[PDB]
Amino acid sequence: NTIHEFKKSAKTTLIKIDPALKIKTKKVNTADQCANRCTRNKGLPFTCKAFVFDKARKQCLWFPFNSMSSGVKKEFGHEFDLYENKDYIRNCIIGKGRSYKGTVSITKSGIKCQPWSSMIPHEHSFLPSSYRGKDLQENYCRNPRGEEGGPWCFTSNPEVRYEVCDIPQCSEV
Amino acid sequence: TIHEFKKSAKTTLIKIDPALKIKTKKVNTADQCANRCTRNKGLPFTCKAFVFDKARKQCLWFPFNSMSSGVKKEFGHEFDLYENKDYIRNCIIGKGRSYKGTVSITKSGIKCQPWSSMIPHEHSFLPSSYRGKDLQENYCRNPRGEEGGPWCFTSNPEVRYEVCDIPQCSEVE
Numbered sequence: 628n629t630i631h632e633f634k635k636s637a638k639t640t641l642i643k644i645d646p647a648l649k650i651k652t653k654k655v656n657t658a659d660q661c662a663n664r665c666t667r668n669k670g671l672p673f674t675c676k677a678f679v680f681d682k683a684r685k686q687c688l689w690f691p692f693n694s695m696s697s698g699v700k701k702e703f704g705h706e707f708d709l710y711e712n713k714d715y716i717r718n719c720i721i722g723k724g725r726s727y728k729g730t731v732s733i734t735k736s737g738i739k740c741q742p743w744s745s746m747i748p749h750e751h752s753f754l755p756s757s758y759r760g761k762d763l764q765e766n767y768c769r770n771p772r773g774e775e776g777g778p779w780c781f782t783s784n785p786e787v788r789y790e791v792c793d794i795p796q797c798s799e800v
Numbered sequence: 801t802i803h804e805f806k807k808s809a810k811t812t813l814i815k816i817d818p819a820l821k822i823k824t825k826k827v828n829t830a831d832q833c834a835n836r837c838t839r840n841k842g843l844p845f846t847c848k849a850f851v852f853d854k855a856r857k858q859c860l861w862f863p864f865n866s867m868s869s870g871v872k873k874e875f876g877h878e879f880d881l882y883e884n885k886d887y888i889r890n891c892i893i894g895k896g897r898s899y900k901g902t903v904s905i906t907k908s909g910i911k912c913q914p915w916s917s918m919i920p921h922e923h924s925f926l927p928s929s930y931r932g933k934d935l936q937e938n939y940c941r942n943p944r945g946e947e948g949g950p951w952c953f954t955s956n957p958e959v960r961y962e963v964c965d966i967p968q969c970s971e972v973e
């Protein structure tokens with residue numbers, strides 16, 4: 628069971644703008660079954676970069692793209708959960724990491740990040756809805772205002788309001 | 801938990817910068833090191849890799865990996881190195897000569913052939929004659945800096961080799 632290995636976005640599927648792009652679907656029992664096929668890439672005529680489980684139609688949708696790909700857009704649906712293969716979510720930072728979408732959720736000194744949706748331990752105004760496009764989801768390290776320090780988070784230690792996270796620059800020579 | 805790490809057999813790491821944090825503990829198995837690393841509990845840093853000393857049954861947890869500036873990768877028959885995939889760059893610079901991620905599937909979704917195997921395809925891209933190239937397992941690699949990026953010999957007898965679909969670091973904003 629490889630499902631916990633994917634970055635999950637609730638109530639979301641992906642749509643092609645490009646009719647050219649390819650999709651594979653199969654009726655299935657559980658979301659874990661979509662995950663296994665994606666991880667192993669068995670019987671897909673492409674590299675599985677993401678999949679959707681449709682909980683109403685009991686279907687996997689396997690994709691050679693993700694939510695960051697050109698010619699694809701997110702779509703809302705109560706029945707869908709999106710799972711993006713972490714191997715195709717850039718895990719290094721460009722510049723100050725304004726566009727960082729990876730899942731690192733621990734600070735430089737090893738403190739588990741506080742969820743953006745929470746006011747515990749720390750009250751703050753980085754509400755996800757105020758910061759659209761900045762992916763203030765779960766407790767991921769993010770740099771929503773593009774400050775000098777790189778991605779950071781509020782910390783689950785009450786004595787440390789916030790700390791930078793230790794995410795490498797993609798290229799610095 | 802151990803499968804979200806890239807394993808390098810017979811390898812440890814040495815820190816030349818003495819200010820870099822380390823934590824060690826005698827354990828039973830490498831799986832237990834992986835668990836503490838993934839959960840990052842009781843570690844005053846971000847766990848980016850660990851080594852398991854099979855002789856002493858000791859975990860060595862690191863806030864660095866083999867690509868970190870000033871770390872000595874060294875042979876040792878009793879060590880296995882495990883690098884957290886979140887910290888191995890999963891995108892390509894230029895032609896991907898330096899790609900060391902764990903993607904093992906071609907663009908058309910075929911499982912790569914192991915570099916050390918000669919079935920289905922016979923070749924002269926042996927690990928031994930490509931030191932530093934990490935021609936390990938069946939990972940997509942670009943040892944000669946060739947145009948289309950990391951590639952592999954394919955497990956499909958009808959397709960000698962094909963490029964993989966590893967994104968450029970410049971692909972996404």
Ligand SMILES: O=S(=O)(O)CCCO
Pocket residue numbers: 751752774779788789
């Ligand atoms: O101003 S806050 O303390 O709320 C966050 C600052 C981190 O840049």
